[PDB]
């Protein structure tokens, strides 16, 4: 719940771990959930740096 201001947005770097995207699109607590470029379903079948 402690989020910084828009001008002072904080950046979190995540890597070298297994990412679980199933919870992301299966939670109704997010009113807006939109992905640009890559479909959210395919994100569970792709790996990045």
């Amino acid at each position: 719940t402690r989020f910084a201001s828009v001008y002072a947005w904080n950046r979190k770097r995540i890597s070298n771990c297994v990412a679980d995207y199933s919870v992301l699109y299966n939670s109704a607590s997010f009113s807006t959930f939109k992905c640009y470029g890559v479909s959210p379903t395919k994100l569970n079948d792709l790996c990045f740096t």
Partner: protein, 49 residues
């Protein structure tokens, strides 16, 4: 140069891969009513056109 701004239509629908030389004139609003629609039926109403 015509006022018919709502006479030319295109589709953004997905999960509807179409084989060579077939037509799908079925105009239905997208309501999965299952898990892959944020888990709620009636939402994610994606207009096909």
């Amino acid at each position: 140069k015509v006022g018919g701004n709502y006479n030319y239509l295109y589709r953004l629908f997905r999960k509807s891969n179409l084989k060579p030389f077939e037509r799908d004139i079925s105009t239905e609003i997208y309501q999965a009513g299952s898990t892959p629609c944020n888990g709620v039926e009636g939402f994610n109403c994606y207009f096909p056109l």
